[model samples]
Target: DREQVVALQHQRFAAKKYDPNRRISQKDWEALVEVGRLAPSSIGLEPWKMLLLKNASHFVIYLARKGVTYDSDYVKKVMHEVKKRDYDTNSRFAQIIKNFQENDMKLNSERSLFDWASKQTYIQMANMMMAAAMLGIDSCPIEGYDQEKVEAYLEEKGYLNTAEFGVSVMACFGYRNQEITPKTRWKTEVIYEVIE
Candidate 1:
């Protein structure tokens, strides 16, 4: 009976979404991040870091430059059309990206952190996202921006030449803005061909 109840809880947690207005409190957000830090990572390399966007300007910059930036209106229209079905406005994910840039991107001389750290950094992101989701929070992964610009912006904000820091992917987390529509999936038998 306990197992049955827990299984429903699991299903409920999995169906979360992005909500802009109801962002997490600072205390709760920090605690969630700490939980993410304690998660198991691949090879113990722990390539990924976190960037929290506490400021409004940082959030605006991210939204504006989410994809390839262009001055031409035509380019903007095309880009928007292409991304009609792909976007998330989660603040938590924004913070993760901001944190990575603050610590990792600006790290020079020891280029290994930039290179090797990237692989591990993303793993941390997934763990964080899933952790948030398990708690009834929603998250969406993002990688649609100019890495160089993000690095520069963080540097301008006093994150430059810090310790081993670099920018990686971003994951947005918040309450869902709309009901998540379920997509059709093929049966497992169709996808997995086992030779016995």
Candidate 2:
């Protein structure tokens, strides 16, 4: 059943809602987050941070880099440390990154680049959700909220450093009540549009 759970977990929105009465164990929780830390990302930037708000167990917020412009210190340092390529800021690969964003794709706006980073963080979110499902835990990915107000609240609560990162998405995880409201989804025909 372990393999089955991991296999099915890879699918979109696999887990059901919460059952707060049950609790998550320490080790199960550890590896679940380790899954998030190891999830892949574009250019291996790993441009995300996981914040556990702990609603008696797990209420985690994902934070993505706010400004990762090609010339930014964050990108430069990451290229060397994360990518393990020295002098990357002046390397050919650096030019490729620069051109990809500036010359090729022309991600000129700050909001656009930040949004792109936030998009990458979703990979981590999905992986974490999958890990949770495989561990028999329930999780809900939430994006329905007031962005401005949430950001302001996070700032007021000292949970965020608006200069570097901002909340991209959040997930609540815990045990489910019983049997979990049966999983619901559209039929394959309704979801797929194969051209082949």
Candidate 3:
């Protein structure tokens, strides 16, 4: 069976759901991922890779670092409790992207190989998000992790050494614990062009 995804508007676009403790069953999580794998990619390059955070300890750490904080104490506490390697940032990860450009999968002919490849990867990301939404799952597109930490962790753990994969986008998925505002949008009269 299939589910319908609500056609979200711009207001819904940036509106996000936060669930610190809501847990997703392993079967549900795997189903969400398997569904996402069916999404299409540019030139079928499918340059994206995904890492799922399932460990409660890991999730707690991820929430600490990746979760938006309201105060200094919250910030400090999250920074301390969360593992250093769970989240990612732009430091070493950028170098890794650059290295990929130099070593393999060169899409730099236009602007940079990685740039082109990343664009394709974002499609995969979007598909994953939409797929999750369709299945009543909540997701967050995380942009706050420590990049150097992630890359170093991957290298240390041999993820980067595998030679067939790269981290594309990072997301956290689960059931919603808080209220999610409904979609809203400005009138498209100006943003649209009509011919009569």
Candidate 4:
């Protein structure tokens, strides 16, 4: 019973290729996002947004430099959902959010607000991947996308205008068409530094 749980975690891997014909149900997609939502974040400020792409979406073509004028109305729908979360005065995360804003400005010398916030998304991404795998869905964390191109595409589509919150990484979820490759890593003794 519990053995499958451990095996599932170890069995999870970045799928090299995905089945084009396969599709994940809306229920499963939301479950993946739920895992991301529940993932821990610094100061409890969940600063990441997951953008799920339909297999037939035009946005994929733009990566090859194909373009779209971007529908203003449709873009607003995407932006609205992504930007809806904010620090509410009555919410539990309010005080923590407030403290960060206050101190960050006061000690502006040594802090990088953007870098710190951006890293949180990877944590969310990892959780989402594992959650998807546990559900027997294949997923891949795509960090190779050109950040500039993605942001430009988003702006071109009216998804975002300002650089306040940006995409840290993109992920693909579907059924896999290939087998999992064995993981290779340096020995534990070589990688770990046991400080005296």
Order of all candidates by lDDT, from best down to worst?
Answer: 2, 4, 1, 3
Estimate, for each residue in 80-175, the C-alpha lDDT of model 1 and write its tens digit.
464342223244543444345446554333453345455565656666666665666666666777878887888789754334355766666667
Query: Where does candidate 4 clash, by residue pair?
Result: none
**Model 1, position 108: C-alpha lDDT score:** 31
How does each model score on lDDT? 0.51, 0.79, 0.48, 0.58
Lowest summed-lDDT stretch of 10 residues in model 2? 9-18
Residue pairs clashing in model 2 are none
Cα-based TM-score, every candidate: 0.54, 0.85, 0.56, 0.68
Better of 1 and 3 by lDDT: 1
Candidate number that wins on TM-score, 3 or 4: 4
- Clashing residue pairs in candidate 3, if any? 61-82, 88-145, 88-146, 88-147, 89-146, 89-147, 107-113, 108-112, 108-113
Error of 4 at 174 (Å): 1.0
Q: Pick the candidate with the highest lDDT.
A: 2
Candidate 3: list runs displaced more than 4 Å: 1-21, 55-106, 109-111, 162-166, 182-196
Cα error, candidate 4, residue 141 (Å): 0.9
Best by TM-score: 2
Residue-level lDDT of model 4, residues 80-173, one tens digit each, is 4645554345455445444555575332321244455556777877787788878888776677878778788777877655344555667777
1 or 3: which has the higher TM-score?
Answer: 3
**Stretches of candidate 1 exceeding 4 Å from the true structure:** 1-18, 56-115, 160-163, 184-196
